[PDB]
Nucleic acid binder design. Structure first.
Lengths: 51, 106, 172, 98, 197, 136
RNA sequence: UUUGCUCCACACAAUAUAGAUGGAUACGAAUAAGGCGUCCUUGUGGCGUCGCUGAACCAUAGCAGGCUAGCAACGGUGCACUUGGCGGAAAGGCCUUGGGUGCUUGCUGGCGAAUUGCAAUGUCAUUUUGCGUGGGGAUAAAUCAUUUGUAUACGACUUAGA
RNA sequence: AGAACUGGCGAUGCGGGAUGAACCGAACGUAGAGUUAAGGUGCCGGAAUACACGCUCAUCAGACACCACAAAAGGUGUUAG
RNA sequence: GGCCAGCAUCAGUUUUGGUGGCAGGAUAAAUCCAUAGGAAUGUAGCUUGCCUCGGUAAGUAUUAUAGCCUGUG
């Protein structure tokens, strides 16, 4: 009789989408990445800074 | 003391209006000391009273009151919207209202 | 347009069985977003070469930032602008901290002094002048003068309340 | 019943053991210690309703004693409580750090 | 906030002061304007004089007593400018205009009261230095107003009496500054300095 | 009998002039003009105050009568160094204008009980001063 | 001309409020300039400080502000008198003398304030009128009609009449 | 005056263009709350006498579509090229 | 148990704030540090007139009794 929004009302957000629980548990919206030590090529940097 | 004032004193400006239409059901209020929406946010939800006088004595008093409450900010200059139970009769454009400090939250 | 930005847009013909790996052109575009950037890019390449967004490709959209956004520079700018009855060229001098800023106040300058719009104005070139004496415009040279000092007379205080009690002054 | 219990204290500014509501008070920053007071006794039955009662007057005294004693420990606090609040000209409640 | 606000039109610009005043009146404020002979208009004298003559040519042809009424005094030029800014054919407009009062000079009830200014209406702040401005008593005299020298004599008189008052005031204020800064060594005054006074 | 000219001393914009940012993020803070860009634009910097090095408008700042010594176009550490070696924050706080700003801030930060106290102290002071004025 | 009219003081009714609720807190001129203070040989002078706005200044504690007892001080302030002076631009206000009387929160204490029963303007202002009490004071005119013609369509105007 | 293709007025209110059959926005059950279009925010008038860059001072300024007009030609007037 | 209200806890629509964590970019650009080079709206210093001591007018000198720009990391 009345529509209820998920993204408020965790109860409907949990009957829909069981995975929201573990999403919140692991937090999975501030997931830290693995840092890679890549450097762009001198050709790229020269082109970006070219006149 | 000299003073007994627990209410900020404001002015009833026009109604909510277009250039050529008005909504009596929303009145515009200027609160003294208030020149920003960020300051008017303090006063949101506060009670307003327009106190007036009449000759007929009704229940011990010749004084009558219209209650209202602040609802939202209006504009950029601290002007505020209010909605009273029974609206303000438009004779009160430029008249003085009493913005009380309850419901309080500090 | 808006608060500008500077991009390199790199672009290409669509590869063919005849011509794989086409030639990769590039432009430094002044625009407030990537969309206007790519648009200006296809505008200027659709002028210069036989290409269009349909028969072409955008390979890179990269943002260029000032290497030194705190060093004051003296920019020369070469402009082409469609006036009402004709189209002309120009050189201008702009002392500013950044290219985006110089080009912003340039568009504003053209709008004010020559009534020219973003659509009418091309930006042929923007170039920092390494040394003084290769400047040609008094309205930059007079700030390039040594030991520069000046006042700002007639200081106006913006008021809060609509009634004052003091009859203010302009001391400074 | 979602209320606040208050005392003036009654001998200080004339306000007895009274119920009030939280949305009708300004919480100031000024704080005496309730430690040493026995207000657990009170309830909506205490303030129930159908000249002053001995329970009321005597309980007011018992609270006032310890509370006033703690209030002496701060200068001008008795006179602060005795005084009443009023907004003066130029007082802007949205910039008063109560 | 104050019940009556006595503005001193010296240095003020007619239109900017007029709009400020009108809105205050409609918001429900009593304003009285004094020394409106010293009120300024932008542009040069000849211009503002021609504009007056253009307004003066206008007149109901079949009865010029019915026509627009061309008031000459600076107070009434101000009133004209300001009633253009008020919705004056309403009860509300009439009420605002009754809250209003305007004067050439500073007459007896308001010479003993403080005068105020309006920085968003002042010539010296608004106008760029260089631009030529006009003075409304000079204009009004040129287009018909008679009593420019009566006001000048009376204002000379008033300025004398007020300068004497200010001498007394300044002497007593010297006395009081002495009596205060001799007591800015007490513990009470140092406590006030701590708290902000 | 010598010539007389007042000359109307101004506070100038110049490398070394120390400004008071009044609006913005900094907004109530000290900075210093490193280099002049135009009649209205200056590069400022205050590293002790947190103020980033940046171009700003001379109406968004207000100049101060204080001045210290800087070479043209100096870097941020340099201006920090010479700021400290001039010790100009002490001069600014010595000023009667910094005192007024702090006076405003303290008066704002007052609570109701500090304010009652202010009142009592003022009544006491004016008792003393009116007694002293009845004499002289 | 009925023992009516008016001014003042009080009391009671009604009358409404373009709309009080700590204070409209007084130089003048300038704005590429000034204010305040000080000094002098008194000026378009030297020195110092201030301004970057009234978020200032004054006032403000007490049963809507009660009754009390003292300490200090010779001050502040309310009222009713009272001395003189100034002010006509719409002055109708500004200043000042002397005492009478109260209050003082300048300081320290005593008593009381409860039930408006968890908030309801919770009435504490101004204006006018009217009958009534205490007194003081003054105790005419116009119009109709008659009349005149310096006037006139009628009104009106000019005139006269105890 | 007369054709082509769409869209509208007619037959249709509402918001804006002061005012207007047809322009702009959007089409109308009775309400309430919120957000917006077009157009605007000195005062009349709801909303910034907002921020920023510059040009213009008219002893005939100018002030935004339909739209209620102005041209050729001229000026060590000012500004930039 | 009828009329007018107030507070709390909730539901829906909505608005205005405070705050935390995370990713991308030249894995921001800068700043800062180090390093190489450079000059000038030429700092210290030196040379020459004015020179009332002092500083000036030039010449030299590019970090020294101040700094700056560029490139690399």
């Amino acid at each position: 009789v009345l529509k209820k929004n998920p993204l408020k009302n965790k109860q409907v957000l949990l009957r829909l989408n069981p995975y929201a629980k573990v999403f919140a548990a692991e937090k999975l919206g501030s997931k830290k990445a693995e840092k890679t030590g890549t450097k762009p090529a001198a050709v790229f940097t020269e082109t970006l800074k070219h006149d | 003391a000299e003073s007994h004032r627990l209410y900020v004193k404001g002015k009833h400006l026009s109604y909510q209006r277009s250039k050529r239409v008005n909504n009596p059901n929303v009145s515009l209020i200027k609160i003294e000391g208030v020149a920003t929406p960020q300051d008017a946010q303090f006063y949101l939800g506060k009670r307003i009273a327009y106190v007036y006088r009449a000759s007929k004595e009704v229940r011990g008093s010749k004084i009558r009151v219209m209650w209202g409450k602040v609802t939202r900010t209006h504009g950029n200059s601290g002007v505020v919207r209010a909605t009273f139970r029974n609206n303000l009769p438009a004779k009160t454009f430029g008249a003085s209202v009493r913005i009380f400090l309850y419901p309080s939250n500090i | 347009m808006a608060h500008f930005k500077e991009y390199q847009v790199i672009g290409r013909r669509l590869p063919t069985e005849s011509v794989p790996e086409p030639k990769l052109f590039r432009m430094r575009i002044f625009a407030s977003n990537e969309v206007i950037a790519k648009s200006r890019y296809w505008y200027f390449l659709q002028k210069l070469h036989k290409v269009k967004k349909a028969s072409g490709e955008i390979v890179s959209i990269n943002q260029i930032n000032e290497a030194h956004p705190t060093k004051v520079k003296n920019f020369g700018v070469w402009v082409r602008y469609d006036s009402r009855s004709g189209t002309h060229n120009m050189y201008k001098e702009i002392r500013d901290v950044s290219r985006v800023a110089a080009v912003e106040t340039l568009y504003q300058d053209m709008a004010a002094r020559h009534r020219a719009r973003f659509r009418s104005i091309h930006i042929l070139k923007v170039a920092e002048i390494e040394k003084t004496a290769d400047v040609k415009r008094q309205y930059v040279k007079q700030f390039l003068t040594k030991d520069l000092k000046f006042p700002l007379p007639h200081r106006v205080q913006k008021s809060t309340k609509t009634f004052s009690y003091k009859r203010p002054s302009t001391f400074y | 019943d979602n209320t606040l219990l208050i005392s003036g204290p009654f001998k200080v500014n004339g306000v007895p053991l009274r119920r009030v509501n939280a949305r009708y008070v300004i919480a100031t920053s000024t704080k005496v210690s309730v430690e040493g007071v026995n207000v657990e006794k009170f309830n909506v039955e205490y303030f129930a309703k159908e000249e002053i009662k001995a329970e009321r007057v005597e309980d007011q005294k018992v609270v006032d004693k310890a509370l006033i004693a703690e209030i002496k420990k701060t200068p001008l606090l008795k006179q602060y409580l005795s005084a009443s609040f009023s907004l003066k000209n130029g007082d802007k409640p949205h910039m008063l750090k109560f | 906030v104050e019940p009556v606000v006595v503005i001193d039109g010296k240095g003020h610009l007619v239109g900017r002061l007029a709009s400020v005043v009108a809105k205050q009146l409609l918001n429900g404020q009593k304003i009285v304007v004094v020394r409106a002979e010293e009120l300024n208009i932008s542009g040069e004298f000849f211009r503002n004089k021609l504009k007056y003559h253009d307004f003066l040519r206008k007149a109901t042809a079949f009865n010029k007593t019915r026509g627009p009424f061309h008031f000459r005094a600076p107070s009434r030029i101000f009133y004209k400018a300001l009633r253009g800014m008020v919705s004056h054919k309403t009860a509300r407009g009439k009420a605002a205009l009754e809250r209003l009062k305007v004067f050439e000079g500073i007459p007896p009830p308001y010479d003993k009261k403080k005068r105020v200014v309006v920085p968003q209406a002042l010539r010296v702040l608004r106008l760029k230095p260089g631009r030529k401005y006009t003075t409304l008593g000079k204009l009004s005299t040129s287009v018909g107003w008679k009593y420019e020298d009566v006001v000048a004599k009376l204002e000379a008189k008033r300025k004398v009496s007020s300068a004497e008052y200010y001498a007394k005031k300044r002497a007593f204020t010297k006395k009081v500054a002495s009596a205060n800064a001799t007591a800015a060594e007490s513990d009470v005054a140092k406590q006030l300095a701590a708290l902000g006074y | 009998t010598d010539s007389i000219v007042k000359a109307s001393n101004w506070r100038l914009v110049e490398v070394g002039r120390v400004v008071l940012i009044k609006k913005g993020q900094s907004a109530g803070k000290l900075a210093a003009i490193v280099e002049i860009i135009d009649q209205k634009k200056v590069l400022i910097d205050g590293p002790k105050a947190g103020v980033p090095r940046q171009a700003i408008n001379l109406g968004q700042v207000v100049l101060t009568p204080l001045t210290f010594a800087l070479p043209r176009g100096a870097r941020t550490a340099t201006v920090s160094k010479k700021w400290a070696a001039a010790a100009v924050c002490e001069k600014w706080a010595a000023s009667s204008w910094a005192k007024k700003i702090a006076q405003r801030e303290r008066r704002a930060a007052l609570t109701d009980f500090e304010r009652f106290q202010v009142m009592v102290l003022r009544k006491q002071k004016r008792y003393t001063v009116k007694k002293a004025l009845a004499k002289a």
